[PDB]
Ligand binder design. Structure first.
Ligand SMILES: Nc1nc2c(ncn2[C@@H]2O[C@H](COP(=O)(O)OP(=O)(O)NP(=O)(O)O)[C@@H](O)[C@H]2O)c(=O)[nH]1
Ligand SMILES: *Cc1c(O)ccc2cc(C#C)ccc12
Ligand SMILES: [Mg+2]
Lengths: 164, 307
């Protein structure tokens, strides 16, 4: 069984932990507990193969960030459509990863979370698709940790990008 | 200051250490993402390769990590250079089976499920082939999802996939003959619409089949017994809420299992051994181990919990 090192990045409060816990454990984490550093393991099937996923759930408010990108194989870059600042911060992240990896060929996906809070949206969908296209046609998804929308597809897509 | 608190599957959660290495188990327990319901079932253990100790709420786990080479020398004859400890969140050994049987919290269930799965795959669960096959089939549903004739009927349950669902002690000799019975029960699980496919429901089914295993929830210690030329037999000593169990250290075979009330114990004066008297058997045996003081104290506390 092949092992995949995935890293969930993003600013604080976007829902990195909720997305990770929903995917691994099938639970929606409600109470906001700032993450120091959490690692999860999960066996999935991607394209008729069993894949052991090691998912790193990172802190959004301080940086050991360079070690994450040196070691990570794929990167989920998460923002909240509720908070404009978290969208603005992902630009620095995308460029830091390309610097540490010394290449633009890095498995990566742009994730707009909290798509269940439509009546609280601040970042439009088109602006997320616009940014992904700017990022060399990077993969893009809108997701919700509660409603279980595009949760598994985040990690599945990174696995495929690593395999290609 | 922070520490990684691991679980049996390799995952971990980093927790802030408010009081440095003076931080207690209770304080670390608060630093997890556990409600009061989830919390009461588990505690912090300190474990290296061949020594695992349940810690108490007032204990300072980082000082035990610091003092680990001295703890190994006191309780074992192990080599301290290959035993770096780590901290784990595991089931409380004192957890009564009646309390666990009514748990409905999904997080507590999966934490118990993963530990139970770890003990099964390592060979610490002794059970008839029917029970093992049933557990393996539930793991296939939990891990691989619904049964599909296209994917699982043939050329699927190789030893690579068998490792994940059967004990390592049965992988070679006995499990390859089980693949047909395993796949049948697996197919029965997926097609039986009366069996809930909720993840926490499936994990509870797995646990239900583990609760009747004699060594379920047991804390394991290491020791030696001499056979009636006297020969040395290294043994695992398992102590749980049901009683005492002796495993051959090499084969994990269940040498003897004794329920509370059907045997007595006596700590040796030297503290490096303890004697067991099987009531209604006339049989006695002595286990040599530098963990004898811990085993007897735990035996007293778990026997005393019963009504
Ligand atoms: N409505 C809604 N709330 C969500 C969603 N995802 C997360 N939340 C909420 O947002 C809050 C923060 O979630 P969390 O996963 O901890 O975000 P985080 O990125 O891990 N924060 P940190 O960087 O400090 O670790 C929680 O109250 C959680 O319930 C979602 O998809 N929808
Ligand atoms: C002394 C004691 C008590 O009281 C409860 C649980 C214990 C567990 C272990 C282990 C492993 C050792 C001692 C214990
Ligand atoms: Mg978090």
């Amino acid at each position: 069984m092949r092992e995949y090192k995935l890293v969930v990045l993003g600013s604080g409060g976007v829902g990195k932990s909720a997305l990770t816990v929903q995917f691994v454990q099938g639970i929606f984490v409600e109470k906001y507990d700032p993450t120091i550093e959490d690692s999860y393991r999960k066996q999935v099937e991607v394209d008729a193969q069993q894949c052991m996923l090691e998912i790193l759930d990172t802190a959004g408010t301080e940086q050991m960030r360079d070690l994450y990108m040196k070691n990570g194989q794929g990167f989920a870059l998460v923002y909240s459509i509720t908070a404009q600042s978290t969208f603005n911060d992902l630009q620095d992240l995308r460029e830091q990863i390309l610097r540490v990896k010394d290449t633009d060929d890095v498995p990566m996906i742009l994730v707009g979370n909290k798509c269940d809070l439509e009546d609280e949206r601040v970042v439009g969908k088109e602006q997320g698709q616009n940014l992904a296209r700017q990022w060399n046609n990077c993969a893009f998804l809108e997701s919700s940790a509660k409603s279980k929308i595009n949760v598994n597809e985040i990690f599945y897509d990174l696995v495929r990008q690593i395999n290609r | 200051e922070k520490v990684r608190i691991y679980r049996m599957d390799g995952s971990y959660r980093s927790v802030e250490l408010k009081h440095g290495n003076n931080t207690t188990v209770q304080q670390i327990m608060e630093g997890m993402r556990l409600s009061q319901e989830t919390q009461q079932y588990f505690t912090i253990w300190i474990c290296s390769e061949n020594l695992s100790l349940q810690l108490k709420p007032y204990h300072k786990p980082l000082q035990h990590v610091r003092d680990w080479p001295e703890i190994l020398a006191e309780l074992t004859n192990l080599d301290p250079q290959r035993e770096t400890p780590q901290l784990f969140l595991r089931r409380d050994v004192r957890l009564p089976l009646e309390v666990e049987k009514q748990i409905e919290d999904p997080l507590a269930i999966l934490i118990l499920f993963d530990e139970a799965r770890y003990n099964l795959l390592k060979g610490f669960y002794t059970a008839p082939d029917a029970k093992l096959i049933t557990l393996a089939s539930l793991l296939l549903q939990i891990v691989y999802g619904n049964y599909e004739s296209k994917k699982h009927k043939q050329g699927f349950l190789n030893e690579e996939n068998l490792k994940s669902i059967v004990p390592v002690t049965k992988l070679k000799s006995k499990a390859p003959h089980w693949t047909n019975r395993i796949l049948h029960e697996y197919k029965n699980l997926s097609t039986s619409e009366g069996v809930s496919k909720e993840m926490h429901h499936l994990q509870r089914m797995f646990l239900q089949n583990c609760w009747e295993i004699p060594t379920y929830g047991a804390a394991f210690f290491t020791g030696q017994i001499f056979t009636k030329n006297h020969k040395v037999i290294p043994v695992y000593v398992g102590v749980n809420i049901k009683g005492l169990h002796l495993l051959n250290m090499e084969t994990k075979a269940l040498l003897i299992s004794l329920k509370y009330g059907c045997f007595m114990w006596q700590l040796g004066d030297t503290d490096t051994c303890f004697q067991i008297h099987s009531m209604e058997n006339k049989m006695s045996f002595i286990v040599h181990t530098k963990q004898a003081g811990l085993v007897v104290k735990l035996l007293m506390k778990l026997n005393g919990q019963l009504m």
